[model samples]
Target chain A: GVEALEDALAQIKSVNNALQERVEAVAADVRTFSEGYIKAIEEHRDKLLQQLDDIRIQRETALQLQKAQLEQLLADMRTG
Target chain B: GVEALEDALAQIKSVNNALQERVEAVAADVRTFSEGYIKAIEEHRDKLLQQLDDIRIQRETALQLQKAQLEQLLADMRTG
Candidate 1:
């Protein structure tokens, strides 16, 4: 049912753009939060360093998982 | 209400770092999703282009709406 409305394309494009902008905005927030996190860690570098290290490892692991999945997706796209 | 706890700053810093790390992790996921979305659009370029065109228009419209809202809020904050 490819029913073309008068402004269907325009409206859909607008929604998608909004979604992308929102995603980027969220990414920016994440960066801001990360900076604040590092600053807080630096405030008491001595005591919290160990805990920070553990967090770093955990985060890295999570990133690795994401990276692997993304890479797989890319490969799929390439072949398909 | 400053209740002196045993590890106030330390605890706060720990939590802050954790939050920051989580944010970055989410950002990474968003980035991955964006890439996938773009790729999917590319694969169905002809059909998707039409849809994407519409999406862009809608997105710009929404952005303008948000901008106006933000400006109004800023103006109110400045005077009030």
Candidate 2:
């Protein structure tokens, strides 16, 4: 039985070999499925990161502009 | 015959469905495991960084204290 660590390792190697054979047998299927899966995940992650970055930039820009305008207004009042 | 081909296809589809479900379940397990593993690693990394910061601060403080004491001793030596 392949329950222990050693057995599991052996079984894993066997499965890996079998999968390799399957990939050889169905190279197009494996490549197409794997590439699509990986691309989908990468796109999803990139979109999420881009959205977060945009939000961060917008927030910081708004904060800086508001601070600058307030500082200028305070300076004007002080001068008047 | 259609019966022979359909039987084989049905068997293949059934096995495929079972494996597909198993893959989904295992993927979820992997995600959960990775989340915990990454969190643990990040915590360990942060702890090490904090320790390094503490050591740097202590080293700097000790060096400053020693420099001040040395300066005082030099002044006394010159005066005495």
Candidate 3:
């Protein structure tokens, strides 16, 4: 449902907000558990970037496809 | 009481899946928006890293304070 998209996007805003809070989240709300997930996001981002070399060399086609898709997503987000 | 946790976790799965979807969403569904967000995140990560450096040792005490707030929030989210 578009409603679900609306809701998910709204929640994503909150999720992104929660993430943006960063230091505040760490200082005011972090638990050993929640912080663990935060750490996980950071690590995932790092791992993904680190693999860019192979991703381009070995996965050239896949990379182009993703970039195209990603760019389209942004356009969708902006237009509609 | 913890029922929300069960529901929240379920919804999180669906939401994450939505995010994971690619050109399927683009061509049919995204390319630009996704790229924009990645760039957004990249900018976010850099500014955030610097945000840490700019701050003194605030986390020295703040981490303890924020940890408790988040714990209570997430703890209350436990499912029955």
Candidate 4:
């Protein structure tokens, strides 16, 4: 009876060790997944920001060209 | 000795139960955090799309107006 009880205890200790291993694995999974998620999001945000900046510069250049051409035309008309 | 082994088994069982609870908590935390992170990213993407669409419409309108004005001026010059 004493040996049987000892065997039962041993079984539980083995199970507990397996459970601890699972805990470590689960924790590592969460850590890695979260870090990867954040990295991807930051990269995407940087890309979007670059796109917006490019659009802004292009629009400004076009508008400035239009304004200068119109002013030059008006000046020529006035002088003539 | 029989009673002592029983007590030891019981203690290990209790520890296992606590470990299982931690496992559930850790799993739930990862699920909730991941869901929230994805939702935030989707919302931000929608906002950026709206901004880009707005810029496109405004730029198109201005360019169309400029083209029409220039065409009208050229038509008058031809007539004169």
* Interface RMSD, candidates in the order listed: 28.9, 34.2, 32.8, 47.2
C-alpha positional error of residue A32 in candidate 3 after TM-score superposition, expressed in Å: 13
Error of 3 at B69 (Å): 35
Off by over 4 Å in 1: A1-4, A46-80, B1-80
What TM-score does each of the candidates earn? 0.27, 0.41, 0.22, 0.50
Taking the candidates in order, what DockQ does each have? 0.02, 0.01, 0.02, 0.01
Go through the candidates in order and give the clash count of each: 9, 0, 22, 0
Quote the RMSD, in angstroms, for model 4.
46.6
Residue lDDT tens for model 1, B12-37: 55765688777667656555654565
Best by TM-score: 4
Error of 1 at B14 (Å): 35
Off by over 4 Å in 3: A1-80, B1-25, B57-80
Give the per-residue lDDT digits (tens) of candidate 1, residues A1-80: 12333245456556766688765665556456545654544454434445655777787677567556655655565565
Model 4 agreement with the true structure over A1-80: per-residue lDDT tens digits: 34454454455556655755665565555556656777786666566556555654675565556556555655665676
Summing lDDT over every window of 10 consecutive residues in candidate 4 chain A, give the lowest-scoring window: A1-10
* Better model by lDDT: candidate 1 vs candidate 2: 1
Model 1 residue A1 CA deviation (Å) reads 11
Of candidates 4 and 3, the better by TM-score? 4
